[PDB]
Amino acid sequence: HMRHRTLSSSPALWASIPCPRSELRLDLVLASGQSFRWKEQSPAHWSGVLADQVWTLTQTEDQLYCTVYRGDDSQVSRPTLEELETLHKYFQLDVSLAQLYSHWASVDSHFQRVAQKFQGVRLLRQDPTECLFSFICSSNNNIARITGMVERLCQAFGPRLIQLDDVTYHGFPNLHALAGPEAETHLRKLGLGYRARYVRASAKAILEEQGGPAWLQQLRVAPYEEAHKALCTLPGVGAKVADCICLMALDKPQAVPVDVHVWQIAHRDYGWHPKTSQAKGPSPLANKELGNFFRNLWGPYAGWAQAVLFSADLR
Ligand SMILES: Cc1nc(C)c(-c2ccc(CC(=O)Nc3noc4c3CCCC4)cc2)[nH]1
């Protein structure tokens, strides 16, 4: 019935945002393990869902073209200003990535080499709910498997938005959908495994102990230190997952998630070791030290610099 759009197929439905390639490269951002809801359905065209709406995104050297599928049998048209403001805030284009890319590299000979090839890797401003349960699904996993777990989760529990070609799109579910007495067994069948317990338990915990999605908006305005400790009370959410949420959803640019991939990068590319801590390998105290090393090295936007290295280490 409906179909995925491209820029040549129907240019009347697209709207442009002025954006240099040095500020944003979609191919290095949308599938670099921040969001798991974007797929290149057509070449150079990234389709995905963003707060109960489907988008398709493409670009030139200095323009970010975008088109919206509103669904609900509505009148097909260009994106509105309010809708393009949502996209402008999603990519965080008010913040200059070029000035960050120069402030990093002043004290970082490694980033200087990496910034040449992988330019325009910016940090997305995601929904807290979507971000939280997506990174509970990330434990001991890869981008391919996580994308599957999140998609199947959204199909079962999330509301239906629109179908395009052979791809039925779903918005991310609310806390109440995941918190019920049937969700763990359902999510296990969908293939989350042990992660099914934490999805349900954290959803039930946020709703009953903390008081619903409003709590995540309190954590947004609350400081990084409090929000991190607060998230660590949740089932299946430790320092790593809390830092992912803090960085990508709660506007904490200094948050540095420490799993094993930063350990590999920090060790191989910076020659870092646990100096103060006696343990040679990963541990709560050593992971905390590694976050402080990168915060001291890069500054208050340390997590944004980490995202450039994560995108570079994948390719
Ligand atoms: C071989 C290989 N190298 C790497 C770096 C991966 C890899 C990448 C990404 C993910 C999903 C994930 O956890 N992403 C992030 N976690 O904290 C951050 C992110 C993205 C950037 C900001 C902070 C899992 C594995 N695989």
Residue numbers in the entry: 10 to 324
What does the study report here?
Our approach is applied to discover inhibitors of 8-oxoguanine DNA glycosylase (OGG1), an enzyme that is part of the DNA damage response pathway. OGG1 recognizes the presence of the oxidized nucleobase 7,8-dihydro-8-oxoguanine (8-oxoG) in DNA and initiates repair by excision of the damaged base. The active site is highly polar and adopts different shapes in the complexes with the inhibitor and DNA, which are properties characteristic of challenging drug targets.
As commercial chemical space lacked elaborations of our most potent inhibitor, further optimization was driven by reaction-based enumeration of virtual libraries using commercial building blocks. Reagents compatible with Chan-Lam, Suzuki, Ullmann, or amide couplings were identified and reacted in silico to afford molecules with similar topologies as compound 7. Twelve compounds showed comparable or better potencies than compound 7. Crystal structures of complexes were determined for two inhibitors (8 and 17). As the docking algorithm did not take protein flexibility into account, access to multiple structures of OGG1 representing different active site conformations was crucial for successful fragment elaboration.
